[PDB]
């Protein structure tokens, strides 16, 4: 045989074995345990708002250089602190301490992107206006 | 939930009514009455959707409240009155009568009839029982109770009802070889002759029916309505006589008009 039961009345063992072995898949285990709700600072949500507490210069991983200008952000939803990249040439001058920022994921579902170590989030908005619209001269950051 | 429902949402109405989907949120809920909710045709539907006399429910009520419409010989000014199978709907204005019979597709077809046979209607004997004071009576499919029935009348028979006095004039017996209408199931609207009756004590009785074209189908005893003998129906049959043409021959019939 092939190491699994073939009998016409072995459906119970077949389905229980599949149930037991589905726990070795990352996504099935995460979904069935609800890790994203307990863990995962974004409590299973695509975006989250937070308050910038400090600007950070994070040294890029090898073989690169050029520290990446992230921000430490405390989420309003749960109080958790995360590090969020501020993507563009500049655009850290648009982000200030105690500013409210919308954060999104980095496109990798965790597992920090690129040469930035330990940064799984990126800044999309600051003070309610788009970071891209601020990098472009379309909009201006509200006074605070 | 806490009591009887009074509304009927659209898409929950019987499909036979051929009601427009995007007309409103509701369909006319058949009031309590002789036949059933699912097996009936509300007078509003018969007057606005099948005959197009009234344009809306308001005009349906205007028709009914001036005593034009008459169901089984009685005025029946109720807009959602549950007229059902083999009921006679006579309009004195536009003087004409209809018999509510099923077309081949299972919808309540508009079946124009003359007064000489609109005088009566047929009723399937739902039960035969002894009433109070030892008086026998017959309960028919339309909820009619008729006292002192012929002692040879049994359940699943048919009785011709005078519809002026509401008495038994004639009665047909459920037996092999008698003409039957099918009043439910997949074969609803089909007309044929009884071939055999399978008993199934405790279960549901089955009956085998052979239409004129020799098509043989089996259906439950609940939805077979005796309407006479072979070639001699006690009622005027609709345009199709319950033949159940397949879709291919239906397309051929349609394209024979070119």
């Amino acid at each position: 045989g092939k190491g699994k039961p073939r009998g016409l009345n072995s459906a119970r063992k077949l389905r229980v074995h599949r149930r037991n072995n589905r726990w070795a898949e990352n996504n099935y285990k995460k979904r069935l345990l609800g890790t994203a709700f307990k863990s995962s600072p974004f409590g299973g949500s695509s975006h989250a708002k937070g308050i910038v507490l400090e600007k950070l210069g994070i040294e890029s991983k090898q073989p690169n250089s050029a520290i990446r200008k992230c921000v430490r952000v405390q989420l309003i939803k749960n109080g958790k602190k995360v590090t969020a990249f501020v993507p563009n040439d500049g655009c850290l001058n648009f982000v200030d301490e105690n500013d409210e920022v919308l954060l999104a994921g980095f496109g990798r579902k965790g597992k920090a992107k690129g040469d930035i170590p330990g940064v799984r989030f990126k800044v999309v908005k600051v003070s309610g206006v788009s970071l891209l619209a601020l990098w472009k001269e379309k909009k201006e950051k509200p006074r605070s | 939930a806490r009591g009887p429902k009074k509304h009927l949402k659209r898409l929950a109405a019987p499909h036979h009514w051929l009601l427009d989907k995007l007309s409103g949120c509701y369909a006319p809920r058949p009031s309590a009455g002789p036949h059933k909710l699912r097996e009936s045709l509300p007078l509003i539907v018969f007057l606005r959707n099948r005959l197009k006399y009234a344009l809306n429910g308001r005009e349906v009520k205007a028709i009914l409240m001036q005593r034009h419409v008459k169901v089984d010989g009685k005025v029946r000014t109720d807009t959602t009155y549950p007229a059902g199978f083999m009921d006679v709907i006579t309009l004195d204005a536009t003087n004409e009568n209809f018999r509510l019979v099923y077309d081949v597709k299972g919808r309540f077809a508009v079946h124009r009839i003359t007064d000489e046979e609109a005088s009566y209607k047929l009723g399937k004997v739902k039960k035969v029982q002894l009433g109070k004071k030892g008086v026998p009576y017959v309960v028919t499919h339309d909820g009619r109770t008729i006292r002192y029935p012929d002692p040879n009348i049994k359940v699943n028979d048919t009785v011709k009802i005078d519809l002026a006095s509401g008495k038994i004039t004639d009665f047909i017996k459920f037996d092999a070889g008698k003409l039957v209408y099918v009043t439910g199931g997949r074969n609803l609207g089909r007309i044929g002759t009884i071939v055999h009756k399978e008993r199934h004590d405790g279960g549901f009785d089955l009956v085998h029916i052979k239409d004129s074209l020799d098509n043989t189908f089996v259906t439950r005893l609940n939805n077979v309505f005796v309407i006479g003998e072979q070639g001699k129906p006690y009622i005027s049959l609709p345009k199709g006589k319950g033949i159940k043409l397949s879709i291919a021959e239906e397309r051929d019939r349609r394209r024979a008009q070119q």
Binding site: - | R10, L11, K21, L22, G24, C25, S246, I247, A248, R251
Partner: protein, 185 residues
């Protein structure tokens, strides 16, 4: 609430976004038939795929099956009525072998060109859009119209739309009004 309203997509995007041969073929079709974007080609391909799937599901049944016969002859009937399919090849295995240009030819924008009503396919598209073409007694401004092979003989200019009608136009009226003075009086 009221019954839900059914709606469907009429197109399907390609699986590979940047296939060079597919892109070139799509631009060729767009140029040949005066199409606005790749979505029209996507829509035609979606309809063609639906037709082919139906034909395959019919062919997988034994011949002289009632459903196969009914739905097959219905499919050939519709396709020959629109003009896509050939009268000779009504066997549904030549439905399996249809192509996108067969549907692109039966467009009203294509037919307005093929009948000489316009000087280019894009001119034809413009003429349809600007309410200049009627099919019967009906102005049609939809370039994707799928002429039913009975309207081919009847495609002509509108009674309105002063190219086949009788009106003087609008910019012509303004030009004449200014030329009344431009002539000196």
């Amino acid at each position: 609430p009221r019954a839900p309203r059914t709606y469907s997509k009429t197109y399907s995007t390609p699986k590979r976004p940047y296939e060079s041969s597919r892109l070139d073929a799509e631009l060729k079709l767009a140029g040949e038939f005066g199409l606005k974007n790749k979505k029209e080609i996507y829509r035609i391909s979606f309809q063609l795929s639906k037709i082919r799937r139906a034909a395959r599901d019919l062919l997988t049944r034994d011949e002289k099956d009632p459903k196969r016969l009914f739905e097959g002859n219905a499919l050939i009937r519709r396709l020959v009525r629109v003009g896509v399919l050939s009268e000779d090849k009504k066997k549904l295995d030549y439905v399996l072998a249809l192509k996108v240009e067969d549907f692109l030819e039966r467009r009203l924008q294509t037919q307005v060109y093929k009948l000489g009503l316009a000087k280019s396919v894009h001119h034809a598209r413009v003429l349809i859009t600007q309410r200049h073409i009627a099919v019967g007694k009906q102005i049609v401004n939809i370039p994707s119209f799928m002429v039913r092979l009975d309207s081919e003989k009847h495609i002509d200019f509108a009674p309105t739309s002063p190219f086949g009608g009788a009106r003087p136009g609008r910019v012509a009226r303004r030009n004449a009004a200014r030329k009344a003075e431009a002539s000196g009086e």
